[PDB]
Structure formats: C-alpha cells, structure tokens
C-alpha cells in the first residue's frame, strides 16, 4: 500500500489544500463530517492512500496545515469542510513573516518547525508503507516559501528515500502583488533545486488565461484557480487509487521524466476544459483530448514550449479507452512536432491509463511536461532580482533577521547555473563540428 | 492578537481622536456608553475586536487610547461631551500652563512631570495587551505640546520598547496657510525625532484637505471636523486588515516591509479615492478602475506636492468592499501603461495589494456618500522633498535675524541645537535626492572576441 | 588543456603469493589486457592509456615501475606545474586493498616512498634551495573528507560535527571553518598526515574491515611572493596541490544489507560517477581546443551534481593540471573488480587499442 | 504425466495469465469456481487434464500457476474478479513499491524478499508434480518487475532445477510505439538472462498484433484483451499436443530438438493462421493449404520483422482440427516450390509437422470466428536480428549522454554492466549473421 502525507504552508497553500480536499472527498464519496456515502465498491478499496480510519467508521485526511497567521486557519476551520481535518494537525503561531523570507526561515519558522516535524513524524509512523510527501505553497510569499523550504530540508534529512513533490505557485512578471517577490523566489529556488524529486510550476497568469480564454468565466476568483490546481493534483496520483490498463505510481513518473537529478521542474496541464455551454458542440475523443492537452495556451506555467525542446512528457488518461488509439496519437504528436523534442531520447512520451474517470466525465487527461523553456521563469525573476540587488532596494529588512549579502549572491549564482544547465539541453544535439 | 495602542497628543491629536473613535464605535456597533446591544442579539463573534477595545466583565468595551495635552480645555470638552462614559478617566491632563507654541517648553521645562504619568499609563495598557503590534501617534508639527512633548514621548518609547512599531499621523505646516508665527521653528526641531525614532510617518496638510473638501464634497465652508473625519477614514482603511477578514490581508509589518526601501526614507503620502458627495454619488459607477485612477491624481493628494515632479518609489493599495483581484490586476496594469507615472528603475514590481471584504461606514451627520468600494493608497515618492524644502526657506528667513530665539533659549535649550536640526533636515533631503538618481554609472564592462 | 590517465597494476601480496594464485593481466606498449580466468578463450579485454605501470613480484630489478618512476612520470610534472603557479590535482582510484594507498603514501622505511612524501620532500627542497631574501615562500596544508555529502576536518582535534561548504564569487569554492596549518619540514607534514589518517571515517563491511566510507582530499596551499626594494609589488604565483584518495566501488551483490550500508554505497557510487563524468567532459574539451583552438562557448562542466567535484573546481577547471592513477589487482580472484577499474579508467581521453 | 507450470510475472504477465486461464477453463469444461459439471455427466476421462490443473478430493481443479508482481493493484483485480475462487490464495504479491520501470529495483533492491516466497511456492508445485516437462514464463521487456525480477527468477530456477525446459512468452518493445521512456535500458539489460538461461524464447510485439487486429479481425479500436486472447490461442496451440490425442503429437522436447540448430539461436517467431472475423468467416474455405500459405505471409507475423529479408532456419507447424496428412504434405510441397521463401542450404528437410484432433474453441464475447481447422507456426529465422538492431540504436542514443543512468546506478547496480549487456547483445547478432551464410 502506497500512502501519502500532505503538507500545506501559507495562505495559498491552505486555500489550495482546502479546495483539493473538497475535490478528493467528493471523488471518494466522503461527507463533510467524514462518513462514507458512496455507491461503487472501488472507492473504499484504496481510500487509505490519503485518509486514516477512526473508530466510528470515520475518515480523517492525512493532512498537515502550517501557517503563522491564525486568520487563514480560522477561515479553513469555519467552513463547509472544516470539521473533516483533525484539530491537532492545525499548526500555527502569531505575527507571521509578512513577505519576509528571512523571518519565515530563520527567526519565526524555527519556532514552529519542531512542532510541525513532530506532527509529521506522528503521521508517518502511523503509515504502514509511506510512498512520499506533498507540499503546496506559494513561492513569492513569506511564511509559505521560507517555512516550506525549511520543512523540505528537514524532511529530506529525515526521510531520504521517500518521494517529495511540490506544487508551487511562483511569481508572475505581470500579475504581481508583493514588491519583494524576487528575493523570496530566488532564496527558495536555491533550495528547491537540491531537496525535491519533483516540482510542478504554477503561475497565476496561466490559470487566469485558462479561465478567461477557455472556460469563458467572466469573474474568475481564487476559487477557480484552486479548482484547476486541485484537478491537476487529483490527476497526478490517480493510478495509486484506482485500477487501470497501465499503472503509474509517483515514482515511475519520477524515473521516466527527469533525465538528470537537477532537471525536476515540470509544467502541468489538464484537459478537457470547454466553457460550460459549448461542450454540447465538441465530442469527447482521445484525439481532441490530446490536441487540447499539448496546446501551448493550456499550460499552467505561462511558458511557451515552442521556445524550447521537450526533454520529456508524461500523459495520464482517465476513462475507458483503447490503448491503440493512445499509442497512435502519441506517435502522431511526436512525429508532426518533430522540432520540439530532443533527439537523444528516441521516445520521450510516458503513458498511463486509468479505468475510473472523474465523476461527471466520460474521459479526461493530465499532462506533465519537462521542457527547457521553463528557464524563462527563472530568467525574468533573476532579472528583477538583479535590478533590486545591485542597489540594495529592501535589503536591510532581511539583514536585520540574521543574513548577509553572501547568501543572496550564492542564491543568484545557483539559479543562474540552473538556467545554464537547462539551456545546455535545448541546443546541444549531436555533432563534431561544434 | 492584533492589538494596537493609539496615543493622541495635543489639541490636533485630541480632536483627531474624537473623530477616529466616533468612526470605530460606529464600525463595531459600540454605543457611546460602551455597551454593545448586538452581543445579545447575535450571541457570538468578537465584533468588539481587540485591536482597539478591551472587554471587561460587564460587557463594557474600553478603548485602548491615551490622550495627552497641556491645556485642560480640550480634554475637558472631551470629558463632558457625548463620549464621557466611554473612555477611562485616565486622560493624562497637565493642569498647568501650555507649551505656548514653544518646542522648548513642551520638551524641556513643562514636558517633564506629565511624562512619567503618560509612560505609566502606556505601560499598563501594554501589559494588558498580548501580541502588541505597534503604536499610532497622532500629533501636529508647529504646535507647542504636539511637537516637543511628542518628541520626548517618542524618545522614551523607543528606549523602553525598542522593536515595536511606531506609526505617525502628523499635520505638517502648509505652504501658505498658517495659524502661528513661530511655526517653522517647531516644525524643524522635530526632524530628529520623526527621523530617528518613528518607523513610518504619514504627512497630511490642511490646505490639501481643504482643497479636496471644496472640490469633491462641494462644501464651501468646511471646518476641522471634516478634516478629522477624512483622516479617520484613512486610519480605519489602514488598520482594517487586522480586524476583518479578506482575500488578501496586509498586516502592519507587511505594509512597512513593502513601503520603506531604506531606513531613513519612510515618509509616504496617504490618499483616499472615493471622496464624493451624496448628490454626485449618482451619475458615477465608482468601479475599481475609477478609484485607482483617482488615487494617482495630484489634485487628490493630501499634501501639497505634485508626484509628477518626482518618482514613485513604492505604492501600497488597500481596497475595501465589493472588489475582486481581477479588476485590481487590470487597474495596476493600466497604471503601469501610463508614462505620466514614473517609477524608479530599481523597483520593477512597484506595488503592494490588499483586499478587505468589510466596506466602509457612513458617519451620521457626515458628508461622505455611502459606497460599495473604496481604496486607500500609501505612496512613497520623492516629491515629498518639495513639501520639506519650502518650509526650510521660511526657517532661514527667521533664523538669520534670530527672531523669537530668546523664547526658546530662555527655556533651557541651547541655541546651537537650532543649526543641528537644519543639518539633519538638509541631510534627509539629500538622501531623497540620492534615491531618485535613475541607476548607477556601471562604467566597468568588457568586450568580446571571435574565434 | 591537460588531462592524462594512468594505470598501475600491483604485485601479489604475501598471502596471495603463499596461496595458489595466478596472474591474468598482460602489458605491452600503452595497452593493458586482461583475460577472464574461467573463460579466457572468449577474447582478451584491452585498453590504452597515457601512463601504465607494471608489477607482479617484489624484487623486479629490471624494467619495473618503482615509486620514484611513477613520481617522475606523474608527480614531478604536477609539482613543477604547481611551482609555476598552475593548480594541480592527482587522483588515486581503485577498489579497497588495490594498492592505491601504497602509491599515495608508500612505505615509511624510506626505501619506497609514495607520491605524496616524494612530492612534499621535493617541494621543501625546491623552496629551501630557491629561498632568497626577496622571494617569500609560504605553505599551508589542510586535510578534509566527504562522508555522505558532508565535509569533515581531520587535522583539528575538535569534534567531528558536520560542516558547510560555500563559494565566494571571486575566490571560488571554500569550506567554512576548515583548519589549515603551516609547515616547515618533513617532520611537521608527517605528523599531520599521521594525525589525519588516524582520524578517517571507515567501517567494516563484507569486503574489507576498514573500507573507506568517505573520500579524502589532502590540500596543499603554496604561495610565492616577491617583495623587493620597490613599489610595484605583486605575487602572481599561487597554487593548490590536491591529492585525492577515493573509496573503492562496491556492488549490491557484496553489500548484502539495507539502510546505512546501502545508502553509503549508493552515495559513494554516485560520487565516483560524478567525478568520472567531470573528468571525461573536461577531457573532451581538452582534446577539442588544443587542436581546433575553436571557442565552442564555455561548455560549463557541471560540478554541483556532487560536492566532491565542486570543491575541486579550482583544481579541475581553469588552467589546472589533473591526472588520475587506477590500481589494478592481477590476482585471479579480483578479475571482476580489476576489469571494472579498467572501465572506469577508460574515459578521460579514451585511447583506442591500435 | 505431461505436467507444466506457468509463471506469470509483471502486469503484462498477469493479464496474459487472465486471458490464458479463461481459455483453458473454457477448453476443459472447468467453471470459474473450479467445479466440473461434466465429471458427473460423462463419468470418466481426464478432461481436467493434469497438464494445467491439479484435482483435489472434493472435485475442485486448482491451476498450476504462480502470479508475481511488485504492485498490489493488478493481482487484487484478479483476486476480486470472476475467477477469485479458482486460484489458490497464494498469489505472491509484494505489498510494497513497484520496480518503477527500473531494472535495478526489480533485480537488486526490491526483487529480493519476494524471491524466496516465489521459489518456495514453485518448489511446492514441482513437488506436487510427477513428470514435470518445463516452465512457461510470461513477462515483458521494458517493465520494472517483468525484466529485473524475471531475470533473477530465471537465474535461481536454472540453478535449482537445471535440466527442465524453460520457455519465454515475452513482449518485446515495438519499433515506434512505446509506453515508457527508459524502455530500451530495461529491454537490453535482459539479453543475458534471455540468452544464457532460457531454452526457447518467443517474441511478440504489440504493434504487430495491433496491425493483425485492425486488418484481419476488422476491429478498429482494440485493447489489450484482444492481444492477450491471441497470445492465449498461440500458447494453447503449442501445448495442445500434451493434452489431446492426435495423428502426430509433438511434445515440447522434440519441438525444441527440431527448432534450435545451435544453443544460442533459440528465438523463433510465432504466428496463427485463421485469424478472421465471423462476418468474413463466410465466403472462405479455410482449407489446409490456405492457412499454411497465410502463416508465411509477412503481414501476419507477430513481430515487425520481414522474413523475406532473411532465411528460414527451421519451421514447426502444429495443426488443430479436421486435418489429414495428405493435404499437409501437399501444402509443404507447395511452400517448398516457391522461391520467395529462402531456406538455409544446410537444412534440407526444413519442417516439423504435428497434427491434433481437438479443434480450437471460441471464447464468449471474443472476436475469433469458429473454425474447423487451424495451425500455429513457430519459425526460427534470421529476420529477428532486425528487431534487435533497431533497439540497439535507441540504446546508444541514450547511453552516449548517460541519460537516466543515475536511477540505475543509485540502486546498487554497477555502471559498466550496461556496456556488458550491449557486448553480449552485439555478439548475439553476429551469431545470427554467421548462420545465414551459405556453406562453401
Ligand atoms: C458534463 C457535466 O456534468 O458537466 C460538467 C461540465 O460542464 C464541464 C464544463 C466542467 C465544469 O467545471 C467548471 O465549470 C469549472 C469552472 C472553473 C474551474 C474548473 C471547472 C463543472 O462545473 C465541473 C464538474 O466536474 C466534476 O464533477 C469532476 O469530477 C471534477 N470535480 C470537481 O472539480 C469538483 C468540484 C467541486 C466539488 C467537488 C468536485 C474533477 C475533475 C478532475 C479530477 C477530479 C474531479 C462537471 C462534471 C461539470 C460541471 C458541474 C458543470 C469542467 O470541469 C471539469 C474539471 O470537469 C470545466 O471544463 C470541464 C469540462 C466539463 O464539460
Ligand atoms: N486638521 C486639523 N488640524 C488641527 C486641528 N486642531 C488643531 N490643528 C492644527 O494644530 C496646529 C496648532 O497647534 P496645536 O496642535 O493646537 O498645538 P497644541 O496641541 O494646542 O499645543 P500648544 O501649542 O501648547 O497649545 C495648527 O496648525 C492647526 O491647524 C484639527 O482638529 N484638525
Ligand atoms: N501485449 C500486452 N502488453 C502489455 C499488457 N500490459 C502491459 N503491457 C506492456 O508492458 C510494458 C510495461 O511493462 P509492465 O509489464 O507494465 O511492467 P510491470 O510488470 O508493471 O512492472 P513495473 O515496471 O514495476 O510497473 C508496456 O510496454 C506494455 O505495452 C498487456 O495486457 N498485453
Ligand atoms: N493560486 C493561488 N494563488 C494565491 C492564492 N492566494 C494568494 N496567492 C498568491 O500568493 C502570493 C502571496 O503569497 P502568500 O499567500 O501571502 O504567502 P504566505 O504569506 O506564506 O501565506 C500572491 O502573489 C498571490 O498571487 C490562492 O488562493 N490561489
Ligand atoms: N609495488 C607495489 N605496487 C602495488 N601495490 C603494492 C606494491 N608493494 C606493496 N603493495 C601493496 O599495497 C597494499 C597497501 O594496502 P592498504 O594501504 O592496506 O589498503 P587499504 O588502505 O585499502 O587498507 C598492500 O596490500 C601491499 O600488498
Ligand atoms: Mg488643551
Ligand atoms: Mg501490480
């Protein structure tokens, strides 16, 4: 049995977690009070991947909530699904970092790191065979980024064998709230490159563009973005909970995606999305599904893969479908888009199929791309970082918390080396002339 | 808990406190006698939020405040008015002569004695607090007590507490209008205290608020009540993120962290967008884009300096009401498109955004229309230097001939201290002119070859 | 543009000579050949190298690769390059008991001294010989080890509590709080090497009772300054001499355990793989520019994949001079280990068997 | 007695086992619950033949099989499905992580522990046997368990038993289609186990079976059930001679004796002639000559290699149904007449022939038409070299840049072993190119 421990940090992490747990609870037929009211017998077959059992035939999510402002925890607790989580897993303090990565990594986060690790240990020893962890956090924030990186470091030290994924929301070039986003993003990407096996990159403009352009929503809020991210997270771990014709645990994706240890940053995507009013006009077939899946405008990270080469891709389908059609469509998309795939992998499309689709759909699919175009996401950040570091715009706020400029320079150099790494895999093909 | 302490010093501070506490009482449902009927009507919730009120056994809610003055008239007007039963009887009045529009009397001779009582009351209120966030200090440059005693109080507070935040809502002298003759001396002598000790100081000018009232609200003969009401609206908008939930809530520490690049340049400008009369409330949509555009107009600023002459170092917008992040992002993009608003090249992001669900309230007998949306903008810019520079000129015209100096010297203040203040003053202006310079020379660079 | 590869085969030890052992390695020219002892009829496996050293029994008066011979081929060149201001590095690769430590240290009887003692003796000779009033020579020696991607000092008597490794933008990689000691004679350096090799991190496995659980790097910091009666005073002559002892490779077949033992084995094997890739990649661009002189961009050689290559960056890249010597066992039992060592040595300017 | 043990390893192995055991249960009249109604209806005979089933006291027939996997999903689906009461509860599942499409995990780290249970159950089944002929092993190259654990299992089996036959029904990676990125590494690393240990190995390709289903059985969107059904038909045709009488019955020993000229070239190709839809079953005679001709057509092969590019070292035909030796001999003569089929000059005879009376059966819900005649061909030819050569190219394109190598090295596998596999692989190809040369 493969069982996952879920960790959430910051406002963004807590809200994504709330929406994701609502989605999973509806998928497994769990009531807001925890009791089960499903119909299919497959739902209870492997519900223990996410949930634990409690004596009165009750199901408790294996989640851990982390923050430093009690406001978000109060918002989560006094909600439709607030009673589902166990109260002891709510870990919070007071006087949060406040978009100061130093405060949430050295000064404040060091207080709660011990309590959160105690809760994590208690959750893990109760798991008969742990598969891996899961962190949801905002990268440009305060307590989220800093304490998430600290937790990643401590957990990697404690549990080196287990898998660790990360659904991270990273800063935007355009839709930017906090002024000191670049410092937090740089000082976090310094740590994500070293202490994570996977890292799904998410951007707010990608989700907004999906909402305005495909879903045709007029007033998208954070609920819709959380909805899309939750759909992706459900799609990723689908094969660990339901049977299929080709199964794919989180590890097989880790093995088949990353060619080298540092290249573990992914571009997620989901299909179908059809505006709630135009689905009557378009038929749900595997060709349409994969054509929407590989579309540039659908990607959830705000990077054009046409500016780079796909190191690898993984497609996980849900629903009853013919294996031959899936294989033929993968061959077609590889052959037609001959210039967007590296040649030193002859066949770089991982495939998985699961029998149980989402509740109200005939079939769906999710996509994990690994492309060199992702380097853009760092370069922009790096540019802004330099523009704010060569003059020391807001530096003192960090240095009063017990840091120094050498750590900033180290983080900047680490990100630049990551960018060059990814850049070396978008031009070097095979030759002797060069 | 998100607890604040509001210190009101001087006549201006006391009257601003009157308006402010009227607004908070109306916001939280507290009656003038302190009782909340809604406690027994709803039966739950902390609507008497701890950010400004302390709850006793009988359900009475005592505000967390300390008024101070050296003239019994104004605080006795408070102590006999409508809200006589709300405040604790410790109003900390010095039943003696005034500072008499003299910094020295308010700082050196008369400012003593009362300082011990004030510090004892502040210590008691801080002891009652659990999770104190900062102090709000209301005063006025150019007054006697409001300048000298405020400086002494800030020095002692910085010594005693150290790390706790200290915000300032101060009234700077206006360019032309003035109700005193020795105003520039008092204003200049507070540069040291408002520079070294305060963590973030907001400047408001009576001329700017008069212009706003005349133009926007269409009030031909305003008085200080309207000015205090506007300032109270701004303070409530700043502090709302602590009290009511929202999609994005901005604590005081975040606000400071995003507004102050370097520790000496913490002088933002406060503006409030939907300042409009009830008759003109119709014929208008008051959407998010409209209020954001109105925030950037130089006409609606609350201190007489044009931001177009300077560069926008940083901005923080705090929205209240029926607002969604989409329109906020669109408005920010449209603002960034315009070339009339200049931003320093060492701040590519430029903005901070907060959103609160609680809409603003309308004070009965006031003049602001009821609205569904509003925003308060704090803009850290270099144009504030102008507001300083003008006043400096006046100081020179008085200090060349040593006019009125004997009043200060006779009250235990060394003459040379005058010059010292100006030096500090001058340095501050230079600092602002340094952070406007658009980028470093970057002379060092190399070339490349081909092989 | 200087990467060379060396191989040295050891002779039969006292236990192997006493027992019924057999030799399976042949030498000729630049080509070393090994034959499977149970199935030699299939084909001999051959590899070409820049340096090769033969040994099968003790005396071997004629045509024998004595310690001084390998020192002249590899050690003397690197010491001269260090004297001229170029960073230098010498790797000693091989399985546990392969005799790489014999080469690096040698016998303390002063009849066959390893590369390190001869190198340091010649350094002390050169400095004292070339010691004048104006030329100021200064040497400071440090010694460190990597265990599970964590750095440990060996010379300081302080506690062995894991330390951090950082990088100055101008001064390159470094280690926080790593002791370095000055030395003026062979006695001081010998004492330091004793105090260091007594404190290495080793563990008992099913292969050898003291198999190294950690890589070991002995660094010498050598500087030569000119201070004449003038104002135009510079140094322009600073070098680092790296002497690397690598823990032997292992397989899961021999490491019949889970957890700490398997984790250490996997970390060690990853470190050797990183180092091998680093040296091979450097060797490709050693071959390229030396004959093209075409600047095919930086082609940055990744050194972060592991910590061992990161700290060795100043001695690996730039104008440095690096070499590696692989220990080979000709005894019958160690055929599989020996062939794996030849495969590991094959890279870094691989030469075809002509 | 003519007793066989079928070992299913991996997901592909388990699903092929599902289809296969459905077929044999239908063949012998066994119900899904193990009971035979016909035992009390006929009152005699060994219709629950010992070649696959062991009969207990109560009249229940337990199959002689051992499923194995490192992921509880597929075997749990078996354990809850229709045939849950058929198999013994010993399904030998490792309730832990999968091999993760990684040879090292399946062979070195995770493959242990479960190996002892699997070998113990195999020993118990062998002890229950009296006259064991050989093992049938179903697996797939390119998977994690199916490659590494299969290699370890066959190493231990060859050590323990030695002289018993061991057949492979393995799925080779396709030329273009592929459902994994690290498939060539896993597929190449098993060359040593499938060369040294296995006695005869049959290769099947999913692309070829997809082509057969879309062309012959007029099905446009096939799934893995059809592929498993075809493979099950082939296995049944191979093993029929042990169970049912016939004019000429071809045991496994003589079949191997005829198909493997040298001990290193034991990679024949399996084909099945009357693959036809029931709608197209009409308008056709399906005589012996027709099916014999259809077996030799390159379109109907089950791995993408054209025999016209190579030479037929040997052929073994196994007929089922209304077949008489006169027409078989006539068809063999007609085949020998044609010059499009090349035979090596040192094999003048070229053919082995077996004939069985029991006709093939039709699975309810299947897609094969009911027929009176059928034939299964096992053709040992050099064209299989092509199927290897393509794979080698892909391996090189990964290994020049050490793509994905750290995943294997970190799990206790020495790096140089990679190269060793290719060397063996290369040698194997050379051997085939040696035997296609005309004598002088
Ligand atoms: C045909 C039908 O019944 O109507 C659909 C529907 O109209 C469409 C437009 C739905 C609809 O979704 C949206 O409108 C939407 C809006 C913002 C963000 C995301 C979705 C639907 O609301 C969403 C809803 O989806 C589900 O129930 C899935 O199981 C989904 N569930 C949830 O996200 C969920 C939401 C709240 C509470 C609990 C679960 C899911 C998806 C992936 C993995 C697990 C679960 C479905 C079937 C529909 C409606 C109802 C209109 C779509 O959603 C999905 C992910 O299925 C949007 O485009 C797809 C395609 C569908 O055709
Ligand atoms: N906006 C506003 N300004 C006020 C108000 N009351 C006083 N002021 C300003 O305060 C300044 C006068 O100095 P005061 O603050 O009254 O000084 P003080 O507190 O009375 O102390 P003394 O000088 O000793 O009497 C003038 O510039 C006034 O405009 C008010 O209610 N609103
Ligand atoms: N013909 C056929 N091939 C299958 C079937 N199921 C899986 N495969 C093939 O098996 C290969 C993948 O290897 P798997 O057998 O799934 O590996 P595994 O047994 O699951 O072991 P792990 O890699 O650890 O998951 C793919 O190339 C599939 O095409 C099947 O039912 N029929
Ligand atoms: N996708 C998503 N992003 C969010 C949400 N809430 C905030 N954000 C983003 O997170 C950033 C602020 O980070 P924050 O949540 O304050 O980090 P924290 O202080 O650690 O909680 C902003 O740039 C927002 O764009 C949410 O509900 N969903
Ligand atoms: N000329 C020589 N060439 C190579 N090896 C030699 C020579 N002379 C002696 N040796 C061997 O050097 C080895 C040194 O091994 P040792 O340093 O103990 O290995 P470890 O440090 O791994 O325990 C001895 O086993 C000895 O047989
Ligand atoms: Mg008064
Ligand atoms: Mg399985």
Author numbering:
A (entry chain B): 1 to 434
B (entry chain E): 1 to 451
C (entry chain K): 4 to 357
D (entry chain A): 1 to 440
Publication passage describing the model:
To advance structure-based drug development, we determined high-resolution structures of KIF1A harboring the KAND-associated P305L mutation in complex with MTs, using the same nucleotide conditions as those for MT-bound WT KIF1A. In the ADP and Apo states, it shows a one-head-bound open conformation. Notably, in the ADP state, the P305L mutant displays a distinct map with motor domain densities appearing at much lower resolution compared to the MT densities. The lower resolution can be attributed to increased mobility, rather than poorer decoration of the mutant in the presence of ADP because the classification method separates the motor-decorated tubulins from the undecorated tubulins, and the resolution of the MT part of the map is comparable to the MT resolution of other maps presented. Despite the poorer resolution, densities between the tubulin tails and the KIF1A K-loop are observed, suggesting that this weakly MT-bound configuration is mediated mainly through electrostatic interactions between the K-loop and the tubulin tails. The low resolution of the kinesin part of that map prevented us from quantifying the openness of the nucleotide pocket, while the overall conformation appeared similar to that of WT KIF1A-ADP. We propose that the P305L mutation hinders the formation of a strongly MT-bound configuration, thereby increasing the fraction of weakly attached motor domains in the MT images. Supporting this hypothesis, the P305L-ADP dataset has the lowest level of kinesin decoration (~9%) among all datasets. The P305L mutation alters the structure of the KIF1A MT interface, hindering the transition to the strongly bound configuration (from step 1 to step 2).
